[PDB]
Write an enzyme that holds these catalytic residues in place. Sequence first.
Site, PDB file in Angstrom:
ATOM      1  CG  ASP A  73      11.730  -2.230 -12.108  1.00  0.00           C
ATOM      2  OD1 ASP A  73      11.309  -1.128 -12.524  1.00  0.00           O
ATOM      3  OD2 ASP A  73      10.944  -3.125 -11.733  1.00  0.00           O
ATOM      4  CG  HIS A 127      11.946  -7.076 -11.480  1.00  0.00           C
ATOM      5  ND1 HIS A 127      11.046  -7.959 -12.084  1.00  0.00           N
ATOM      6  CD2 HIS A 127      11.275  -6.342 -10.547  1.00  0.00           C
ATOM      7  CE1 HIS A 127       9.861  -7.755 -11.488  1.00  0.00           C
ATOM      8  NE2 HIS A 127       9.973  -6.789 -10.563  1.00  0.00           N
ATOM      9  CB  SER A 150      13.784 -12.793 -15.138  1.00  0.00           C
ATOM     10  OG  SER A 150      12.847 -13.849 -14.963  1.00  0.00           O
TER      11      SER A 150
END
Lengths: 52, 151, 48
Positions: B51, B29, B103
Site C-alpha cells: 500500500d 493508499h 485513512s
Amino acid sequence: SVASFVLLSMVGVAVGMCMCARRRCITPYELTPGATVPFLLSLICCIRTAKA
Amino acid sequence: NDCIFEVKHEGKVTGYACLVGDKVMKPAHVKGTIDNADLAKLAFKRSSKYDLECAQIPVHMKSDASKFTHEKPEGYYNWHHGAVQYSGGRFTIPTGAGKPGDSGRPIFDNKGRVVAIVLGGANEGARTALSVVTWNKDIVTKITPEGAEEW
Amino acid sequence: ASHTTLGVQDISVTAMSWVQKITGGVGLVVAVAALILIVVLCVSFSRH
C-alpha cells in the site's frame, strides 16, 4: 526474419522477467525507512560498488 | 504527543510523512498529492501490495526527522483516537474508536520513535482488531485479521 | 530433376546445429530468467 524477430523478442522477454524480478524483489527493501537491502542481495540486484 | 513531522494531501492527512531518519515515507493508499510543498521534489517510489509510497530527504528539512525505529514488545501504544493495546503480535482498539476517514494514521510509540500505520480493522463481537503495516527490522509487512474493513 | 523437391524449410544440413546452439542458448536464457522470476514471485507471495 521471423526467427530473428522471435529470438530478439526472447532476449527482450528474458530481460523483461529479470526487470520484473528486480522490482518485485527490491521494492520492500527500498520503501522501509532507516533500512538497507543486505550486502549480498545488493550485489545480486546490481547496485553500487564493493561492500560500501 | 502530536509534536512530530507533518504532511497533508488534497486536505486529507492521507498517511503521515514518516521522516524516520533519511526517508519521506508517505502511506497514501488513497487519493492525494502534496499540499505541504516544503519538499515537493520527491523521487516517488511505490508498491501497492504493501500500500505505501516513499521518497528521500535531500538536506533542506533533515532537522524535522526522528531517529530510526523497529522494536515492538507486548503492552499498549498510542494513536490519534486513544490507547491501542498490543498482544499476540497485533494491535487492538476500543470498538468504534476508528472510522472511515482514518485513512492512514501512525502508532507514535511510548518512547518518541514511530512504529506502524493503521489502515482499517475488524469487529470481534466486543473487541476490535486493526489492519496495519509494520517494519520487521528489515522488509515491511501487513497484519490483517478475519473479516477486516479498511479506511 | 530426377529427385523429389526439398522440404525447403524442413531439411537443413546436419551442420545446421547452429540453430540448436542458438535456440538452446536463448531457450536456457529464457528458462533462467523465468526461474529467477519464479523464485522472487514465490518470496514476495510468501511475505504476508
